Write an enzyme that holds these catalytic residues in place. Structure first.
Site, PDB file in Angstrom:
ATOM      1  N   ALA D  80       0.831  -1.190   0.000  1.00  0.00           N
ATOM      2  CA  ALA D  80       0.000   0.000   0.000  1.00  0.00           C
ATOM      3  C   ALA D  80       0.875   1.252   0.000  1.00  0.00           C
ATOM      4  O   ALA D  80       1.885   1.328   0.700  1.00  0.00           O
ATOM      5  CB  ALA D  80      -0.922  -0.017   1.194  1.00  0.00           C
ATOM      6  N   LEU D  91       6.415   2.535  -4.450  1.00  0.00           N
ATOM      7  CA  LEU D  91       6.178   1.120  -4.743  1.00  0.00           C
ATOM      8  C   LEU D  91       7.472   0.489  -5.280  1.00  0.00           C
ATOM      9  O   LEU D  91       7.885  -0.562  -4.792  1.00  0.00           O
ATOM     10  CB  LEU D  91       5.016   0.977  -5.734  1.00  0.00           C
ATOM     11  CG  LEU D  91       4.685  -0.447  -6.190  1.00  0.00           C
ATOM     12  CD1 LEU D  91       4.440  -1.376  -5.003  1.00  0.00           C
ATOM     13  CD2 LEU D  91       3.476  -0.456  -7.120  1.00  0.00           C
ATOM     14  N   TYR D 120       2.081  -5.448 -11.766  1.00  0.00           N
ATOM     15  CA  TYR D 120       3.165  -6.289 -11.212  1.00  0.00           C
ATOM     16  C   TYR D 120       4.043  -6.922 -12.309  1.00  0.00           C
ATOM     17  O   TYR D 120       5.116  -7.437 -12.000  1.00  0.00           O
ATOM     18  CB  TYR D 120       2.577  -7.268 -10.188  1.00  0.00           C
ATOM     19  CG  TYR D 120       2.311  -6.604  -8.857  1.00  0.00           C
ATOM     20  CD1 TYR D 120       3.367  -6.088  -8.115  1.00  0.00           C
ATOM     21  CD2 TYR D 120       1.026  -6.423  -8.366  1.00  0.00           C
ATOM     22  CE1 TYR D 120       3.162  -5.428  -6.914  1.00  0.00           C
ATOM     23  CE2 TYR D 120       0.803  -5.772  -7.160  1.00  0.00           C
ATOM     24  CZ  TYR D 120       1.875  -5.272  -6.434  1.00  0.00           C
ATOM     25  OH  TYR D 120       1.696  -4.626  -5.247  1.00  0.00           O
ATOM     26  N   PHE D 396      -4.002 -14.309  -0.549  1.00  0.00           N
ATOM     27  CA  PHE D 396      -3.207 -13.668   0.495  1.00  0.00           C
ATOM     28  C   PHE D 396      -2.754 -12.295  -0.015  1.00  0.00           C
ATOM     29  O   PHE D 396      -2.324 -11.447   0.760  1.00  0.00           O
ATOM     30  CB  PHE D 396      -2.021 -14.550   0.902  1.00  0.00           C
ATOM     31  CG  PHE D 396      -1.009 -14.771  -0.196  1.00  0.00           C
ATOM     32  CD1 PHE D 396       0.014 -13.862  -0.418  1.00  0.00           C
ATOM     33  CD2 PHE D 396      -1.103 -15.871  -1.033  1.00  0.00           C
ATOM     34  CE1 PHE D 396       0.924 -14.058  -1.446  1.00  0.00           C
ATOM     35  CE2 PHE D 396      -0.194 -16.063  -2.059  1.00  0.00           C
ATOM     36  CZ  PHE D 396       0.820 -15.158  -2.261  1.00  0.00           C
TER      37      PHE D 396
HETATM   38  C1  LIG Z   1      -6.148  -7.648   3.195  1.00  0.00           C
HETATM   39  C2  LIG Z   1      -5.125  -7.854   2.075  1.00  0.00           C
HETATM   40  N1  LIG Z   1      -5.789  -8.022   0.778  1.00  0.00           N
HETATM   41  C3  LIG Z   1      -5.878  -6.743   0.064  1.00  0.00           C
HETATM   42  C4  LIG Z   1      -4.747  -6.477  -0.942  1.00  0.00           C
HETATM   43  C5  LIG Z   1      -5.112  -9.033  -0.043  1.00  0.00           C
HETATM   44  C6  LIG Z   1      -5.874 -10.375  -0.091  1.00  0.00           C
HETATM   45  N2  LIG Z   1      -5.885 -11.020   1.241  1.00  0.00           N
HETATM   46  C7  LIG Z   1      -6.913 -12.032   1.536  1.00  0.00           C
HETATM   47  O1  LIG Z   1      -7.707 -12.304   0.703  1.00  0.00           O
HETATM   48  C8  LIG Z   1      -6.991 -12.745   2.914  1.00  0.00           C
HETATM   49  S1  LIG Z   1      -7.277 -11.478   4.221  1.00  0.00           S
HETATM   50  C9  LIG Z   1      -5.647 -10.910   4.806  1.00  0.00           C
HETATM   51  N3  LIG Z   1      -4.581 -11.230   4.080  1.00  0.00           N
HETATM   52  C10 LIG Z   1      -3.373 -10.856   4.468  1.00  0.00           C
HETATM   53  N4  LIG Z   1      -2.253 -11.232   3.628  1.00  0.00           N
HETATM   54  C11 LIG Z   1      -3.241 -10.111   5.673  1.00  0.00           C
HETATM   55  C12 LIG Z   1      -1.962  -9.573   6.314  1.00  0.00           C
HETATM   56  C13 LIG Z   1      -2.298  -8.889   7.505  1.00  0.00           C
HETATM   57  S2  LIG Z   1      -3.970  -8.919   7.750  1.00  0.00           S
HETATM   58  C14 LIG Z   1      -4.393  -9.794   6.402  1.00  0.00           C
HETATM   59  N5  LIG Z   1      -5.577 -10.210   5.932  1.00  0.00           N
HETATM   60  C15 LIG Z   1      -1.236  -8.227   8.413  1.00  0.00           C
HETATM   61  C16 LIG Z   1       0.232  -8.475   7.941  1.00  0.00           C
HETATM   62  C17 LIG Z   1       0.415  -9.725   7.046  1.00  0.00           C
HETATM   63  C18 LIG Z   1      -0.529  -9.707   5.848  1.00  0.00           C
END
Ligand SMILES: CCN(CC)CCNC(=O)CSc1nc(N)c2c3c(sc2n1)CCCC3
Ligand SMILES: CCN(CC)CCNC(=O)CSc1nc(N)c2c3c(sc2n1)CCCC3
Ligand SMILES: CCN(CC)CCNC(=O)CSc1nc(N)c2c3c(sc2n1)CCCC3
Ligand SMILES: CCN(CC)CCNC(=O)CSc1nc(N)c2c3c(sc2n1)CCCC3
Lengths: 396, 396, 396, 396
Positions: D80, D91, D120, D396
């Site tokens: 982000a 970035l 990317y 993720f």
């Molecule tokens: C929210 C991020 N999202 C938007 C680009 C990407 C897709 N992520 C998901 O589908 C599962 S929810 C999630 N995933 C993380 N990697 C993480 C991380 C968190 S919360 C969290 N929640 C804190 C640090 C490690 C990465």
């Protein structure tokens, strides 16, 4: 069917009518804050026999008018007639009593936001500000070479949590409201309420974020259902630099397709972009409505355009008096006369002219404003126009 | 890749590019009429090697500007680059050649309608009129007590077939275009074309009808698909009485739910109704775009507001000259100078100010217009404003 | 209820059933062209008592299969049962008779386009090509640095009228159909019909335009109702250079928001852009369906992947024979055997494998293809795969 | 504007940027679980002056590649840039630092899920799996005679509460992820999170249910707003029998009209039905993106198709080295060379080939992959293809 000032025991009945009449009603807790703006005899109720079947009140407000003059303003609000008691003269009776109280209390103007546009004209209220929704497709938005704040180095705008920067929002808003026609003093209890709405609600609105500049802020949240739309609830900017910088930051919300805002017709945003058309007008509506309570006081209190040369005329307001109106050096003198009228109009029309949102010429073309002298028309247009574009503060 | 005036043998190739570039293209037959408005060397084409891969032209128009002054105007039109030849400098090359010809031929202004809003700014064109769509839910529409033409007796408006009253439409339009900024002379061949579009097309547009008053007319048709929507293609009214009477007749289309019209921001229609909100703004967009070809000629030719007192300043147009501008008694004098500039702006910005659709103050707030004197800003706003609201004539 | 070859006097009755059964039916005039592809005893009708209540026919086609081998193909078409005579065995009876005739006439394969996907499996037809709709939001589309034909100089693509370049389209298509599995010979009468559909229809389709390269073409038209959508009806390209150049031209249709095309799953278009995601798959469906009439002839006629090493197996088709299948050096030998089967499948499954659109492994996972040896499965996958991606020629 | 590993005091600022950048962000509580997968120096932040205006990190993952080989994988995530600090190189700077750390730490590959498809590629990531949404109109769905598990007796599938059968889901998933390219180890903390999302939320998602087979499971919930749509969030099946039995149970959700699932292009579901067309592809998109960090290690680590005969070539990755690549007996040897390249491609292209989702031939046709030998192309296609279809594990 009698008409009274409510006692403490009437308020549960008033909240019931409120919940049934207003879909956007936040319950009794939030009502406590708004109640502190209602003066001692600022409210009327109608009881049958007893249950509350009608209510209306006003709040003590401070409204900025052209020339940066701040008028005490009676803010009509919380008006409701039970669905069981329509077409019974109740609105007319309540409005008459409140206007009597407002007049006697010494307010020069009353103001409201209208649930419908066909109701309040007959009670002497005229639409006085225009709400203008712009929707920007931010994916195509590029800033013009001429736009401020496009140089190298760091940004002056910070992304912050609203509740942690209350003081800065308050101070920026205070500056804004004092220099812009349509500005309203926002008391402490309404800041409490605004910052409470800023947090997320389970199965409701999403969290609000703020973009903060030394001379402006924007509050925004992602829409409930359209997750590619960001809604700017409020943007207050005291300088052009702040306005541009906040919009550079909003266009930088790269996960959004569209940014929408309820602004005013003279918002410079379209002119900041290489393609003015990207700032689409998706919605237009009357904002604040004004009823001039005291014609002489109101007309003498506001500033007028210095550009127009001194002129005199005779203005008649229908069932509102006739006046010798003399305008020069940005000031008006307004005194009683029985001389022949050169201009006639209903009271509502004067409210519409008062902040400079509507041109005399335009109202003349609809025959809401009658004169036989077209030179006088041009002079009124120019005189009543506002140097600083009229904006809308907050709904009440 | 060379650039030439087209011969007769180039026009089949130009019509092919036209059919491929413009979805609204009526074929070669209708093009004959429009062609008569193109002067001898009013057109350029680009050939490859040969096939037409680029084209642009201008038409001889007459445009009304504030003070009811009629300027010869070069109407840019029929501009197209083949999809096979994008990003090749062709638009820039064609626009440069036409502007040279237009300038040398002695036109003070050029004008166009923009397919996109991001294209024409860089070539010195500024949006100068605003299109404003109003949609009226006519089922709720009631006329205000003050509205003209609500008395007993017969109506002054007749429901007629357009093709049987050509002379009356022509004469009413002629009066309209001469007294309204943005007015264009409509030559005979465009009346031929307009009245041809008035009849029904198999699997196309429905028949057009006309409402005719001695001092105004309205052309309307029921929408193709929404059979409860009437579209007013054109309403021209020389008096407020005519405007109101035509709208009384349109609201009397009892088989319709909604009447829509593309009008201007100062259309008095909302003020003719008891509920102004029923005239909803459903759409807003730039109308006519202006490029000032000769700054002194253009600024000296238009009238200015008599209300503002005499003042002098120095205006610089970016790569367009610097001028001593003196405005008083509704006239401007504009002469060369090397004195320090008090106002700077790009050429496009001046086009946007020229008919009074945009305020100097608004453009200043976006920094499209630079001055250090806010008094001068107010004086420009007032001076360039138009007594008669600016409207849009017909698309080309 | 008897089953006959139609006489000339049956065809008005067949056209009536056609108009009632097929919404897309062009009337008897266009049917004349298609009729020339129906051989003497290529059609069956069912009469009641007489009126035509059932019909079916095949056309003589030429279908390209992997290894650029062209097979005579019976193209089933114009199949219809009257709504008055459903659930009466008529489809089964007509299909049985035509398959008898097709088999006896010496066609190795039959083919069709299916109105519904649940009908033709039970008659031994398997889906053999996949239609893939891509919609490009061309406003964001940028070509990758690696994409061909992005250099300076002139374009190799011309924008033309289809009817004036028939010869070039014909020759390009002929080259295309011979080198691509799924290719069909397009006879002269179908070119006549295609170029007739290219012109505008009153209250129908808009005019078609062509983009022409020496080694490819694209036919496109603006959509009837969505005027920001261009539909590519057909794009045939013999080289990667042609494919890219045509797509550079289509992305240059600057008045459109979206370009759509019905293509195949391996269309390289997404990989030509910096953002592959802009080429969205909006629609997927079975294209051509194949029924293998003669298993040995069909399996021996096509080429196989040279990469897989020689292998032998025993294939049983349900009620279609059992065969010793030996594949090596890109050729198959397929001979009768009563040895134990190593692979079993219904006839429809073999049709689905035959052009390489579906993997043996995938059909095995659904148990439409039964073996106990997973090594054999991998070998089938690799062997039946097509070097040149399978595409869909034209609907019939 | 400096770049650092975050301390504990930076994380509140990172969560603020997260809430503002990611609409799907679950708050700090759920972040605790995901944080345990971030190694000590797996994260970078950018501060201004201080507030967090940029962040990026990677997580320690285990990714299955063809040949059932499990690679340590750096999972890029939580990337982000503040809307206040766009177009500032942030970035690029963060990605460069993380790639340095990832390379030095000894990861052969990095992986991500892309918010947009245009970002990317320039950092060497290529789309490597394809998401494929199927929507089944289950009212028409009938299973083919050939489909497994259609016999008399009891069902092997149980309808259960997810939280009461955690162990069985875990064990089934573990088996699945180890045998399928694209499989990811799901650690305990992500099972905690998955089963927390399974319960109903007030004004949010509905309760999730599970269908459990000894060799597969499906998690599904009714859609929030479309109450006739069941969404399968996850279906993991180790045998064809399990896959079919789970789909027999899903089609038995008789109160639903439609079942949707995000699956892969080779899902056998369509072939289990008598009408393949009922499994409509409603949506397609890139899934997992791969950046090959170490070309030799990655190419030597995966298995290759045994069907293709031994071959040698020279591969150049743009700014990624040149290698003698020898493939035979399902293994590759990849060693340094300065011999002339026979194949060239950017790093991202190699990532796209690596799991067998995209064919070399297809990328060659877009000129993302350059060779002069078409035999070599066929050999690459066959060699890099995956016996077991590539699937997508979890986002993720
Ligand atoms: C929210 C991020 N999202 C938007 C680009 C990407 C897709 N992520 C998901 O589908 C599962 S929810 C999630 N995933 C993380 N990697 C993480 C991380 C968190 S919360 C969290 N929640 C804190 C640090 C490690 C990465
Ligand atoms: C709910 C009233 N609504 C419907 C016509 C009008 C628009 N009002 C708002 O947009 C802000 S919410 C609000 N506003 C009040 N004036 C009040 C008052 C309350 S609650 C309250 N809440 C109690 C007595 C004073 C007025
Ligand atoms: C079709 C052009 N269109 C797309 C950008 C612009 C808007 N034009 C209209 O709304 C009236 S239709 C028309 N207009 C012309 N100027 C012309 C000209 C023709 S046909 C014709 N038709 C031949 C040469 C002179 C210009
Ligand atoms: C109309 C049939 N349609 C509905 C199932 C199938 C798809 N056909 C097309 O997309 C091209 S239009 C066409 N096609 C024919 N085969 C034919 C035939 C005709 S007209 C005609 N037109 C007369 C006898 C031979 C087949």
């Amino acid at each position: 069917v009698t008409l009274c000032s409510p006692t403490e025991d009437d308020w549960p009945g008033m909240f019931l009518l409120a919940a049934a009449s207003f879909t956007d009603f936040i319950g009794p807790e939030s009502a406590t804050a708004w109640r502190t703006l209602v003066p001692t005899d600022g409210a009327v109720v109608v009881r049958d026999g007893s249950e509350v079947v009608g209510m209306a009140l006003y709040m003590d407000l401070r409204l900025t008018v052209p020339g940066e003059v701040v008028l005490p303003t009676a803010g009509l609000s919380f008006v409701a007639v039970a669905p069981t008691h329509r077409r019974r003269g109740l609105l007319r009776a309540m409005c008459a009593e409140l206007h009597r109280r407002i007049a006697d209390s010494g307010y020069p103007v009353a103001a409201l936001h209208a649930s419908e546009g066909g109701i309040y004209g007959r009670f002497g209220y005229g639409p006085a500000t225009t709400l203008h929704e712009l929707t920007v497709d931010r994916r195509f938005a590029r800033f013009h070479a001429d736009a401020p704040g496009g140089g190298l180095g760091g940004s002056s705008v910070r992304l912050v949590r609203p509740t942690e920067h209350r003081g800065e929002f308050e101070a920026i808003y205070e500056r804004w409201r004092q220099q812009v026609p349509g500005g309203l003093l926002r008391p402490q209890v309404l800041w409490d309420e605004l910052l409470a709405e800023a947090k997320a609600a389970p199965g409701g609105d999403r969290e609000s974020f703020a973009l903060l500049h030394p001379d402006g802020y924007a509050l925004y949240r992602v829409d409930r259902t359209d997750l590619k739309l960001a809604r700017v609830s409020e943007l207050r900017a005291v300088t052009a630099d702040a306005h541009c910088a906040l919009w550079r930051a909003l266009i930088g919300l790269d996960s959004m397709e569209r940014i929408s805002i309820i602004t005013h017709p003279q918002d410079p945003l379209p002119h900041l972009l290489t393609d003015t058309r990207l700032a689409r007008t998706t919605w237009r509506q009357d904002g604040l409505w004004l009823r001039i309570m005291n014609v002489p006081a109101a007309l003498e209190a506001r500033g007028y355009a210095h550009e127009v040369g001194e002129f005199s005329t005779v203005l008649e307001v229908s069932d509102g008096g006739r006046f010798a109106l003399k305008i020069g050096d940005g000031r008006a003198r307004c005194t009683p006369t029985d001389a022949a009228a050169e201009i006639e109009m209903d009271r509502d029309v004067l409210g519409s002219l008062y902040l400079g949102a509507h041109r005399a010429s335009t109202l003349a073309a609809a025959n809401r404003l009658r004169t036989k002298d077209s030179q006088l028309l041009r002079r009124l247009d120019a005189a009543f126009a506002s140097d600083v574009p009229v904006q809308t503060a907050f709904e009440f």
